[PDB]
Amino acid sequence: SIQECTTNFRNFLMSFKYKFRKILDEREEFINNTTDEELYYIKQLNEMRELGTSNLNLDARNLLAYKQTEDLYHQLLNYPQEVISIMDQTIKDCMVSLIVDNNLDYDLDEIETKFYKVRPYNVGSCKGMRELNPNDIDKLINLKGLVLRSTPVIPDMKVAFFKCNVCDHTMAVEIDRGVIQEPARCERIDCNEPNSMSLIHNRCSFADKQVIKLQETPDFVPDGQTPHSISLCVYDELVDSCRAGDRIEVTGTFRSIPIRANSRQRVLKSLYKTYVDVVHVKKVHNEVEEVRQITDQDLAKIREVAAREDLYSLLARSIAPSIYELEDVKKGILLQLFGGTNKTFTKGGRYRGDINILLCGDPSTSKSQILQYVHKITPRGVYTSGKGSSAVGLTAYITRDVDTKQLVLESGALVLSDGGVCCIDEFDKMSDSTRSVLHEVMEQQTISIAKAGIITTLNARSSILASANPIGSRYNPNLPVTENIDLPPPLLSRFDLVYLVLDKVDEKNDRELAKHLTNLYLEDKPEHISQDDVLPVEFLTMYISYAKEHIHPIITEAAKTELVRAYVGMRKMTTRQLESMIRLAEAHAKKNVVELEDVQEAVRLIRSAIKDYATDPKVQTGKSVIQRKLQEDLSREIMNVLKMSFNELIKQISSDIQEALSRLQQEDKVIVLGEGVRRSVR
């Protein structure tokens, strides 16, 4: 009903608080009594008069929170063709009531003449392009896809302009439902001549109309099927707001227009061209004021794991519970998913904050299995090969549309992954023309292509996770790293972590690895492992997306001092290694600050690959003393006291400290006397 939907929407905009949205979202532990009690729609209506806009970003989730608007939200998803027209009239009467209640000296004619439009978005009916049932004609369905191409603005006539050829009588006839009712006779009494009005297209009021081709999201497309596309229609002032390679959320009506079988006849085919009329554009003009993702109950569990000291070991085991060992390798990949923040500068250059990890060593060591697991976690991750993708498939291949037969520009494997991790297999089997393109992606995160007279720079800010392989498929220990792999020296310095996973023959390692792989095939579920030791895939994705949008670590003065000293010591044994330790230390605490414990962990990951070598590439008790010198060093401080606690010995002079104390206890040289303090021999 018209009168029923009017009073329901009027009282909703005058009696709504932020506490109602927190009820349906299961948010009862973070409710403020100063900001949630105030009306949100009142401040939005007051800002429209001050700024002078004419579009309201109405949230569809707010209608479900109110118990009196339960039937109104169901009617909007059914046929919004008659519901939006009611909301455009109820918002006009509410604007006039706010002026009389405030008693302002403003022009009332300039406000009533302005036609206000409502833009609903973020509904509950999130049906994809494959679930478009035929009974959903003219229904607002939210779509979550990706923009493929962009078409220029096409003018759409709205008000026709006519002019006589005898008396020159200008007229203005509006178009109703796409029907241009031309006048048969002139309106002038002195003229009155049939078929004497001329249509002037240069004096007509045109409207903006843009066609955007949206591609289906690969996260929802089932395995074995190709993602289709759909046509979108953007009107009003929302044009020129969606570029190629952007993740938006289209929540508009699902209309349809008939097609003609011939360009000269008036016949129509049985098929109807389906198109989605865009109403609101929510990126994943104006700006998002806030987001209400996940659940507040899950945030308490997130902070519970963050308070535990075993976070670096729990997340390393849950990222790959099917691969044994590789603790140093999994610790680097975990930081690649998080990564450092992006401190954007206005007068400075853009610094790449991603972590480029390169795997090396002998093959058949669970190298290809790692690239298949990160792709399933990242929502924008891809998986490509070496020889299967040259320098054209990774950049942007110049394709053509099968509808307009025009030269279009399609994104590649490096452009579609705007925000994820790119998994490339067989990095050593790439051509020379493909290795030169990755030099600019790992530095400025930009792809400049100048072919066929089109010199454009494409942005590609994503991490590269590849796995190299030797020439003879066997890493010889008597050969340098630059000679075993055919990778360019400049390409090796651009990476951040160059792991070398070797296949060493060990009886103690092959016995434990075979028992771990056999337990996964015996039982489908790890019953021996507790639930608090392995995190599910759904909880791991919510912990990375939440920290990458709110947690921003800042390098303090104490953390920046140790980074300079660590960079000088590494050269005394390029500038790319300095930026790798910054993103590694920032992702470990992602804590609002960078502590000293996070910087020390990043140096251990870098020293794990660049050590045990100096002028040439390719036990410690008697030959390298240490144990012989520590017996006279730690006992020297103890003898000086008698002439102490365990914490005072470290500050006055810690795995080697406890080992030296156990050696003197067997020779009757010291006294334990508990773990608190130590006593010397009498």
């Binding site: 800002e47 001050e50 700024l51 002078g52 806009t53 700006e287």
Partner: protein
Amino acid sequence: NSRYLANSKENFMYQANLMDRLRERERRSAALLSQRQKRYQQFLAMKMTQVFDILFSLTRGQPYTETYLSSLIVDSLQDPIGTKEASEILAGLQGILPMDISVHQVDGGLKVYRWNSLDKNRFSKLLQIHKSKQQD
């Protein structure tokens, strides 16, 4: 004899009396630094006069943010004014016509400008008053 900065005097190669001149250099912190701040006012007072005759000679009423208005002034005066200097032009014009230009701050670091009626005769009379106050 007009302004021509082209002379051969530049780069001509080749007790405690001069030490007193270095002591007077400390007074430049309140004189030379104050003159530098007044030099930017000369490039902002007379610069905002032609800006009001450029934006108001076009659209009006519709809302315009600070980021959208800054890119329109630089693109129209590149044949210049930087991005930082364009922000001070709209800020100085608010004190002249507070009843014509409405500024509403947004919680996040954004400023939206809006004007209804921009009269050229009213701005021409107020431009001579602001120019004479800075000269004293």
